[PDB]
């Protein structure tokens, strides 16, 4: 039996659910040979009501070099980056839910990802299998990938289908915890674009640049646009696509018209659909946002680490696209 000393960065909805999940499942962890010992939880305001015991909270950065593991679910990019890098340079692994971080600081983070120090299942579709789904898909070669990767924009579209306005639906999405007070990253497709980047790096190109993704959000959509789609036997969804074009991989996020019985259109939750050679057509669905769903992913990654398995590796080298085969209707 050994102690697993954990530094948690972020005590929001994600960080709180992960804290409580770790302790609630400490009986599982002992089967893996450890007892969880949180060193501290970096938070913005330590005197705010929060579902973590108050004495464990830290308003200021603390030394991570004594941790066995860093778990991060902070907002943003540069501050978490600067906090995690000294831990990663010391060979301490990182489990993170921070898709922005990984999408936007990859020049700094790739060498540690290549060494198996970064676990980030929770950074795409929360605790729904997504990174692991693509790790198994690596048996095949990708022909086309389409996902519905953001929870907020799925929620808003579903509600606008029912005749709720954008604003009404957004307010609801904010109360359910899918969206922040400023939902810009969600509703402009940028969160889908960060997640799409990460999918690309795992499966097809370990250098894929976030800046190459072409992203458009849901701003042109209204209940009318959606009802008319429905009349045409279609549903409109914000889709994240990865496909070959003129010999290179291209990534796009945009509203797309789907057949109404397509797996993407029907899905229970966020979804990832792929067509690959020789496997064929495969699909995964589940919750893509929320504290408990995200914490599940972080905890799956902690078990992965405890079992002796390395983190999520980028593709070992860029793969060649097979189909230039390049799909679509936009709205």
Residue with the two structure tokens 């019985």: 261
> Is residue 121 part of the contact set for Na ion (CB under 5 A)?
yes
Per-residue DSSP letters for 28-93? HHHHTTEEEEEEEEE-S-TTS--SS-GGGEESS----TT-SEEEE--SSSHHHHHHHHHHHHTT--
Q: Tell me which of 125, 213, 276, 302 binds Na ion, using CB under 5 A.
A: 125
Torsion sign over Cα 175, 177, 178, 183: positive
Per CB under 5 A, does 284 bind Na ion?
A: no
Residue 286, marked binder: no
What is the chain's alpha carbon radius of gyration, rounded to the nearest angstrom?
Answer: 20
User: Does residue 20 interact with a second copy by CB under 8 A?
Assistant: yes
Choices 53-61, 144-152, 204-212, 254-262 (CB under 8 A): range interacting with a second copy: 53-61
Residue 69: name its binding partner from Na ion, a second copy, none (Cβ under 5 to 8 Å by kind): none
Question: At what angle are helices 13-24 and 291-306 packed, to 10 degrees?
Answer: 50
Helix or strand holding residue 289 (H, E): none
Nearest to 242 by CA among 263, 266, 213, 267: 213
**For this structure, is 162 an active site residue?**
no
Cα–Cα distance, 97 to 112 (Å, whole number): 16
Size of the site for a second copy (CB under 8 A): 63
Rounded Cα gap, residues 240 and 233, in angstroms: 21
Which listed option, Na ion, a second copy, none, makes contact with residue 130 (CB within 5 to 8 Å by class)? Na ion
Residues present in the chain in total: 331
Closer residue to a second copy in complex, CB, 290/314: 290
Q: Does 228 bind a second copy (CB under 8 A)?
A: no
Contact between 157 and a second copy by CB under 8 A: the answer reads no
264 lines the binding site for a second copy (CB under 8 A): no
Binding site for Na ion (CB under 5 A): 121, 124-125, 130, 297
Query: Which residues define the annotated binding site?
Result: 10-15, 24, 44-45, 48, 50, 99, 121, 124, 126, 128, 141, 177, 180, 290
Binding site for a second copy (CB under 8 A): 1, 12-13, 16-17, 19-20, 23-28, 30, 35-37, 42, 44-55, 59-61, 74-79, 82-83, 100, 165-168, 170-171, 174-175, 177, 180-185, 187, 218-219, 290-292
């Amino acid at each position: 039996m050994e102690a697993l000393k954990i530094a948690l960065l972020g005590g929001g909805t994600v960080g709180s659910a992960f804290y409580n999940l770790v302790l609630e499942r400490a009986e599982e962890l002992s089967a893996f040979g450890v007892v969880p010992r949180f060193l501290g939880v970096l938070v913005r305001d330590p005197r705010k009501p929060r579902a973590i015991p108050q004495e464990l909270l830290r308003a200021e950065p603390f030394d991570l070099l004594e941790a066995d593991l860093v778990v991060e679910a902070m907002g943003g990019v540069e501050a978490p980056l600067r906090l995690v890098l000294p831990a990663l340079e010391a060979g301490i692994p990182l489990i993170t839910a921070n898709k922005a971080l990984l999408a936007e600081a990859w020049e700094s983070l790739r060498p540690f990802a290549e060494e198996g120090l970064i676990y980030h299942e929770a950074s795409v579709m929360a605790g729904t299998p997504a990174l692991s789904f693509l790790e198994t898909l690596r048996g095949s070669e990708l022909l086309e990938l389409h996902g519905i990767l953001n929870g907020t924009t799925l929620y808003i579209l579903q509600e606008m289908e029912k005749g709720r306005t954008y604003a009404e639906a957004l307010l609801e999405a904010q109360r359910l915890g899918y969206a922040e007070a400023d939902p810009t990253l969600d509703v402009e497709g940028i969160d889908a674009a960060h997640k799409l980047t990460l999918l690309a790096r795992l499966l097809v190109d370990p250098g894929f640049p976030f800046a190459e993704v072409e992203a458009q959000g849901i701003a042109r959509l209204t209940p009318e646009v959606l009802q008319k789609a429905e009349a045409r036997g279609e549903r409109v969804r914000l889709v994240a696509s990865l496909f070959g074009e003129g010999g290179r991989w291209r990534a796009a996020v945009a509203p797309r018209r789907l057949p109404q019985d397509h797996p993407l259109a029907r899905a229970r939750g966020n979804a990832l659909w792929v067509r690959a050679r020789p496997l064929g057509e495969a699909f995964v669905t589940g919750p893509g946002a929320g504290g408990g769903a995200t914490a599940s992913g972080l905890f799956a990654d902690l078990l992965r680490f405890l079992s002796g398995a390395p983190g999520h590796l980028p593709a070992p080298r860029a793969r060649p696209p097979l189909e230039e085969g390049s799909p679509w209707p936009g709205v």
